[PDB]
Design a protein around this ligand. Structure first.
Ligand code: HEM
Ligand code: HEM
Ligand SMILES: Nc1ccc2ccc(CNCCCc3cccc(F)c3)cc2n1
Ligand SMILES: Nc1ccc2ccc(CNCCCc3cccc(F)c3)cc2n1
Ligand SMILES: C[C@H](O)[C@H](O)[C@H]1CNc2nc(N)[nH]c(=O)c2N1
Ligand SMILES: C[C@H](O)[C@H](O)[C@H]1CNc2nc(N)[nH]c(=O)c2N1
Ligand SMILES: [Zn+2]
Lengths: 411, 407
């Protein structure tokens, strides 16, 4: 079965056959579309097909499918499964795995870059202190003084689900949130709960608007420990506007390195529950969502006030106006300080080119429209006009529940 | 089976059961989501009628009454004998309103029950269709104080006798591709425009020429008709602060009136059923003006504002887009023609979603269409999970009639 997608600005029609290799389910049926729903221990039993399929893919990419080296690896993984009940990836398969999970990430607009991923293998790590060391190295390497480099650090895989490695932070670098007695929040509202756990674990909170959180790190199923990232390692950019001089006086900054740490990487049936990865920001993640979501820093009003917009009717589009300025400021600031960032026009255009190349070479590109279209100026980006097919390939990145909801405390 | 939708900005959770009534299909499966694809007999007819009538009698709190049973009996007799049936006025009105209520792509549905229904099932000729249409336009326009309405022509019979309005909207601007190679007017209608010309229309060949109606009755060849200009309320587009804006020469019409859809009620198909409400500003300022394949004017507007067009990162496109949309809303408001802005339309739809969850057990919504085409995440619909499913009565698309009809 061949599936066509049309771009309605260009009349370019593409044909998907890759969706035919899709295993996992979507959430949808013939009767309901769940395309906007945010979130919709294995036995040997289920493991060997997952391994086989994975190594068939790997061995095809390298043009060795059916080789003696292909067959010997299958038999060797097989034996290891029935013997030890799990198995170890070779270096090369890990690398190829981590790249493919990014490549298959249907919600990621930055995938044109999937083949440039620095993989750090931390599978020999045993302790939280060891994890900190690995994470500091990742953060320094990826930062690279502003010339950001994509990277992933991969800690040991799940075994019995009782010995899990986790990074409890949702991103390696992120700001604290503090709910005040009056009901206001200080700093980032999205991180209040996490901030509270850190405080409980003994972090002494500076309690400012932009306090970088400590790392809370779990090794081998043990209780997590607190660590401070060395500040010299945390690159930050003060936000100013190219024409509005009062902009800097809002006191805003952001960090340069987006590094997601709470996802689960699946490769050939193996589950890597600590696999923090980092790329660089599209400006709208900060300027639209982090600053302007109502449940985040919510600076829209204060910016519009300062701009002396007519705020008495929404039909003045004062919000739309304030939002573009804030986004201009974010990009100006990053570029001025030579920190890598991509605006949303440039990122979405790149993604269309990636997507077409992917249809030409791979037979498809799973893509989640709801996520790929930027959260401002939707129809002036070419992705808005692109039809997309959403489906799940492995290897993949998956969500997992927050560890504080599942962890068995040792004490 | 009882599904949850969460609003991530407010944490409000709503439980959908109304989806279990879904009859039609989505295009999606367990393996592939098609959420962003634009377009994914006697025996047949009786279940359809039955299902519709059961919901009609339930809505008037008469489920299982003699009157309910008798109508089922009566429609059933009419199907078996005539192989079709007729709706009572009351059922017609209920069906049309419900087709709107169930339109999962429509943000404006808080309004669904104030819909003026004009019954034109007694119509027999294009001239008649023209008269009905003019009456609809004038009623709906209401001198700028716009009122929702639909006009319903006779239902399909053997599909050789269809009533069609060939226009996509009752009011739209012409499209002429050039020797010079570009496009004068609205490039979306270039083809319809030549069908008109190659059917007789004398085109003024302007940028904003109201198209002539091309109406088809009883499956006949269709006929041209100019809408009396006096019935076409148009708004000249100016900016509340940029004086030069007025000199771009932009105008838009006040009445959005989709005329190419098919209205399905109780298995009955109404292939000509033009309906109209009023504009959300973004439809004109974002889509009509700025789509690359539409009037595509962002380039010219950015110049006039003297923005740095050297690089995409100055967000000059975004700046100009906002000002264009400020201007649309300003013009319509100044001229007292009804329009709604995207903030206000989406806030209304969230409240409508609330009402429908508590009163009906949910509300089909297509997130991809409902989220406006600018400033997505600063409107509350962005943060609202929605379930999309197909209920009947419904509006459906249908082939452009020039691909179907025979001369
Ligand atoms: C290199 C520069 C990159 C850019 C500009 C980029 C862009 C983005 C953006 C804008 C999103 C949506 C984020 C949100 O709204 O929450 C996203 C999602 C995603 N990205 Fe990328 N990305 C980049 C690199 C990467 C890398 C290196 C990986 C993994 C190796 C990755 C994997 C994903 C995944 C798994 C999601 C889904 C997040 C979720 O479902 O919560 N990204 N990316
Ligand atoms: C009262 C003022 C109204 C507002 C502000 C409104 C808003 C909208 C908007 C913004 C769209 C997306 C249009 C597009 O992007 O092409 C839409 C689609 C739709 N609306 Fe409404 N609407 C209103 C009245 C109505 C009425 C009176 C009906 C029918 C009785 C209706 C039925 C639909 C249908 C069927 C669609 C989508 C059709 C498709 O799938 O292409 N609308 N509406
Ligand atoms: N520039 C980049 C690169 C990769 C990224 C990967 C993930 C994210 C952030 N994802 C956060 C998702 C938070 C969330 C909340 C609720 C539900 C849900 F599914 C996700 C940002 C990136 N930004
Ligand atoms: N204010 C309103 C109210 C109701 C409306 C109903 C329909 C439309 C227009 N829909 C046109 C979509 C055209 C199209 C082309 C190609 C594929 C496809 F799915 C739709 C605008 C409205 N605008
Ligand atoms: C309910 C809805 O799916 C939710 O708001 C999504 C919409 N699209 C998104 N797109 C991106 N990139 N990131 C997000 O957090 C969201 N949130
Ligand atoms: C590819 C995508 O399905 C297509 O561009 C859609 C996106 N969302 C839309 N939303 C609305 N309201 N109207 C549209 O025409 C479209 N076009
Ligand atoms: Zn779907």
């Amino acid at each position: 079965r061949f599936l066509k997608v049309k771009n309605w600005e260009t009349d370019v029609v593409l044909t998907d056959t890759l969706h035919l290799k899709s295993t996992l389910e979507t959430g949808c049926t013939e009767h309901i579309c769940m395309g906007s729903i945010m979130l919709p221990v294995r036995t040997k039993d289920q493991l060997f097909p997952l391994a086989k399929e994975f190594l068939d893919q790997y061995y095809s990419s390298i043009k060795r499918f059916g080789s003696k080296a292909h067959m010997d690896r299958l038999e060797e993984v097989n034996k290891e499964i029935e013997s030890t009940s799990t198995y170890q990836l070779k270096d090369t398969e890990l690398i190829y795995g981590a790249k493919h999970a990014w490549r298959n990430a249907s919600r990621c607009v930055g995938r044109i870059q999937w083949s440039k991923l620095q993989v750090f293998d931390a599978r020999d790590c045993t302790t939280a202190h060891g994890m900190f060391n690995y994470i500091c190295n990742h953060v320094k390497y990826a930062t690279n003084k502003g010339n950001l480099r994509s990277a992933i650090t991969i800690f040991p895989q799940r075994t019995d689900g009782k010995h899990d490695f986790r990074v409890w932070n949702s991103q390696l670098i992120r700001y604290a949130g503090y709910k005040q007695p009056d009901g206001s929040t200080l700093g980032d509202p999205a991180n209040v709960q996490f901030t509270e756990i850190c405080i409980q674990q003994g972090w002494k909170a500076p309690r400012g608007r932009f306090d970088v959180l400590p790392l809370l790190l779990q090794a081998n199923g043990n209780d997590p420990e607190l660590f401070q990232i060395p500040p010299e390692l945390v690159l930050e950019v003060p936000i100013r506007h190219p024409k509005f001089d009062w902009f800097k006086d809002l006191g805003l900054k952001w960090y340069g390195l987006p590094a997601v740490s709470n996802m689960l990487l699946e490769i050939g049936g193996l589950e890597f529950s600590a696999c923090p990865f980092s790329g660089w920001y599209m400006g709208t993640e900060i300027g639209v969502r982090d600053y302007c979501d109502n449940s985040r820093y919510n600076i829209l009003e204060e910016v519009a006030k300062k701009m002396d917009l007519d705020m008495r009717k929404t039909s003045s589009l004062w919000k739309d106006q304030a939002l573009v300025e804030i986004n201009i400021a974010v990009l100006y600031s990053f570029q001025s300080d030579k920190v890598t960032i991509v605006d949303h026009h440039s990122a979405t255009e790149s993604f269309i080119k990636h997507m077409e190349n992917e249809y030409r070479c791979r037979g498809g590109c799973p893509a989640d429209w709801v996520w790929i279209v930027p959260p401002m100026s939707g129809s002036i980006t070419p992705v808005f006009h692109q039809e997309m097919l959403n489906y799940r390939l492995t290897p993949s990145f998956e969500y997992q529940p927050d560890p504080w909801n599942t962890h068995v405390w040792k004490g």
